[PDB]
Symmetry: C3
Amino acid sequence: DTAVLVLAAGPGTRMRSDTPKVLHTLAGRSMLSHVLHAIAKLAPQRLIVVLGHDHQRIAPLVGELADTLGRTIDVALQDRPLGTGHAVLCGLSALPDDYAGNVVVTSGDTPLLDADTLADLIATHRAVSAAVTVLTTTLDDPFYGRIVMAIVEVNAGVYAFDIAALRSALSRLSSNNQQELYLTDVIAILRSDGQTVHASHVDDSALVAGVNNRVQLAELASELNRRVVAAHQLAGVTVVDPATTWIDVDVTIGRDTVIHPGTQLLGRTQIGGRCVVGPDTTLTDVAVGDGASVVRTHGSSSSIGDGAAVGPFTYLRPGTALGADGKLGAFVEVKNSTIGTGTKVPHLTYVGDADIGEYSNIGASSVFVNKRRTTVGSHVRTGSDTMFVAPVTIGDGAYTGAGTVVREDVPPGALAVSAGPQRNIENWVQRKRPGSPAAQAS
Amino acid sequence: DTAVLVLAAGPGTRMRSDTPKVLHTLAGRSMLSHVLHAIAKLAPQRLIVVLGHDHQRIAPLVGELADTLGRTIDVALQDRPLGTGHAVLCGLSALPDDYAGNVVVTSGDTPLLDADTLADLIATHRAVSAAVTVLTTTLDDPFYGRIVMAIVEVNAGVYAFDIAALRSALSRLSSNNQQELYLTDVIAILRSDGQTVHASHVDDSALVAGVNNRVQLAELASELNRRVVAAHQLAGVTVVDPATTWIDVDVTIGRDTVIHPGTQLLGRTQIGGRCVVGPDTTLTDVAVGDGASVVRTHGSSSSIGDGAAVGPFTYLRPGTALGADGKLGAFVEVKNSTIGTGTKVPHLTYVGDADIGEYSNIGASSVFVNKRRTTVGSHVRTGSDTMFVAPVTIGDGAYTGAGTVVREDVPPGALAVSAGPQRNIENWVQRKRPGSPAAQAS
Amino acid sequence: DTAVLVLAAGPGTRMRSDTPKVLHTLAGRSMLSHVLHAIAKLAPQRLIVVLGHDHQRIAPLVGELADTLGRTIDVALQDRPLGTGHAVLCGLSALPDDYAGNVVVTSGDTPLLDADTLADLIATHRAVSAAVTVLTTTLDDPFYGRIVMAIVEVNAGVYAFDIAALRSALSRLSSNNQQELYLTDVIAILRSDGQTVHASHVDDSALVAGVNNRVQLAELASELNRRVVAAHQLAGVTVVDPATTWIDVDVTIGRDTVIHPGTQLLGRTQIGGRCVVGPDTTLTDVAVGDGASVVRTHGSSSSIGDGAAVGPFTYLRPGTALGADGKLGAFVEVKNSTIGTGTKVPHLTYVGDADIGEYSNIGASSVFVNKRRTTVGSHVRTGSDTMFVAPVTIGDGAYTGAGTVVREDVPPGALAVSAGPQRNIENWVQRKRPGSPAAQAS
Ligand SMILES: [Mg+2]
Ligand SMILES: [Mg+2]
């Protein structure tokens, strides 16, 4: 039996933020969520999180996280900002007084720490019957106090403890130094009691790296990102420039797709196999089938079918569904609309809140204007500069003239027109502009 | 009393440029301007710049720089390309023959050298009563002759001197070697005269790094850029990808704003707090209020109010002012135009040389065509595909139909229309296209 | 006389690809093409490539490569997947039994190896009368068996041999270990025969780096890219951000042009001198004259004349020719069209399959709709929202009204119109919308 305490109670001062440090995000999850996902993979019997400013936070634990993870996470509060030693004391109150098992202590600002690293700590600790084991790592420039004697190779800030050793070393602890009670002092107290102080060493330094400021945040965002890219590359995805390709965790991509530079794939986006994600593409929660091209596109909450072509310069808003072999071309925007198999919207148009059938063609520079919705049939051909004033129904195989405004329904196989006929005014430019265009004409 | 000489007289051959080496830019200023800004912070009593090809240059010193800095910068010319030793001799002529104080010598191609580094040099030099002190630094791969004995840990190329020692060591100097007179030889001459040769060492190597070619230029542009980003991050700005975020010096940004990858912020741009600068945004001299979003936008000389939304795919030309809570959407361009509080230009339009009031809506795919100017009132709603042929006045709460061309004024609360009415040609496609669209209709 | 064998017969398993490893590309050429281009520069008397899955491959050697290189490349097949030792045996069959000269052996997955490195190997080998020489290099983390005794400073995998020594050491070779015949074992066999084993060492490690997976592919793509950028920078091209500028081999760029971040220049693209390639530009096979600006543009198979301006947000499709001093502005797309000296297409238009003369102006938000082609004369001014329904001829100095649909020819100096006249409906908004826009009007 192991109880895990996450200390998330500090102020996060040097973030210079009105957003609590621990709720700051990277690769798709907040630091706290990254911390709790790794620990939940470990599955200890008791998992407890300790808080300071607690109203914003407590809501997202358990509420959202204990559910998403399908387990209980207890929360303990820390009324006075006493320090990490006291925080640990606050977390222990949530255990039955007669609690038997080990206690592992961690923070909420190490977003890379993983279940294996935690498991190895617990394993070394039971192996040597320890009392206390402390995780460490070795660096180039130590700042990160420093490391078994004691603590001022640095200290990771992650500990396994014997509950009886811990409760006792804590009962006898002071303050004078910042003016708080550190947990590091538990190591020196148990050394006085002639206790065994063990230390599990982590070769991979970035797994236990913490975030105190926005410079360090960007660093770990960067390292985590390299590791998600390299995992996709090794499964069969070409990433031309891993330095300018941000891929969130969860995002899935398949065999032989090519990802070109300047691309972010975010949230729960999925890419099928054999795709081309061109350059400068940003997709959050977008699903793409196999053999599709998505180039210079900014899109979210949408789906793009197999062998379809989107880009360059296309904007997809929430609720867009484009069928297989479909096309959205340059300078098009689509919001909350369904577009069938094989249909093409190639240029300078906006399609909002409509449904379009299959193998239809929408002419350049058109607009769907506004609970009824416009509906357009299959094999329909609309001419350039058509405005579709909602709601309106266009039947299968219908056509529209260039420069038409559609305000009424159009039957299957009718041509809808409105533009007046062309008149030429001979020698106008000679008379109304004498100079320039006038000459030529001459 | 200290006189500072900047040697800016060499040809800059391996830049392979028709632009004088010293006028090549990074982070917003030319190398020379970066050099003179640091020295002007030092505030010596005499500041003198020595030139070779001098017509392009002399204009920007003092002219532009001595003003901007509000002090005098004397200029000395160097008629024959004799070398750095002679250049220094040329610079000394601009001093009263009976000049008392120290002489500090620097180049115009170290754009990172700062006032502190200069101050420490002067301080060490007076501390030991020196005659000559020379700045040095230590590197991985020395190229950068090499360092107290003499000079072939490398030599920075920055010196403090006693004026009497300097004038004397210079009077006795030769040429044979390139075939010029080096200043490095002053160190070996004063060593013969048994003089004290001191040396101030700089740990931060990049402060004294110089630029001889375009590979080194990009390097220092890169290093300076990391340091401007990290300063913003530590003040409370999230930069998701510091490697692809170019921020010029002077640019100011505020608390809790988020800057997404592929963004350049240039010239005297200002970002308020709580903003989102999405990805792929380039802004030169643009001012943005608090809580505004600016995503995939290319803009200059413009202002965007509080809580406004611009992007993705928007182009702002000089003289654009957008009020608070305003909106410019995808595929819009705006030049020299004022747009009031709460007004929205959401799609595929161009607005040139107009003024628009508050809480108005401009319909998709419209154009403001051309000393009079078009003026549009508040709470106005224009329909899609409207062309506003300047000059024209649209009164408050007026409307426009889809596909209207406005050539005349529209009173408060009138609807302006021009499009003809819709006609349907039944069974047209059967007759004019037998095959395809024809079937369906069937 | 030297015969060069390229071993391109392995499966490439950890690429996780349906595209043969050796046909995977970087900087414009496949790895195999990069390998054969370097060797063809060497010009040995016999060049032979050995294959496994061979149908896709054999076609591109010689077919395409032996031609492009203007020499013969023989191909040898390897029926059973026996290993590199056997592959070499298969390659030797393509030599006359009585072959006299040296044999150099290389792979098809080292895309950086160059002719000098090959020449130095051959030179060291003849210098010491060797039998076998093996190329080596020294690394930070060896994985890359390891190096004269034998092979488990690592082994490059490139060898020079005496033909008689090689044929003999090969005749006596086994299998048990993977379960194949390695060529590394030839080194240990000739050591038994007391033969001289020489070893040419390569300081530049990246020249002999190989690609087994997509992580290593991106690495070498990155290194090759740094070296092409630095060569352009040293010839007089400013690259603001070499990390986000992909330039393919062959691409040429000239003096004093500036390349801004996020730019790929691909295929056989050429940039003249004094240009500005803004940020976020992607050009494949595009030719640009001197003094032109190309900003936020995605283009291919096209040409842009001297002092012309394209961008931001412009899309060029194959067959676009734009003359000198021409302009394509924001949100324009052009396919297979010719546009003369001095003509401007500034906003929100599409131009497909047309020819346009000189000093013409095309008004915002227009479309060229479809063997005849539309033709537009010089000094022509078309108004906004004009649809040109192909085919149609517009004569020199002709004009068009705003919101015109052109279906018929327009003579030199005529004005073409079609839009109806403007009508205002007074007090419409009071009656049809009581609330909001209604008030004002009040
Ligand atoms: Mg239109
Ligand atoms: Mg129209």
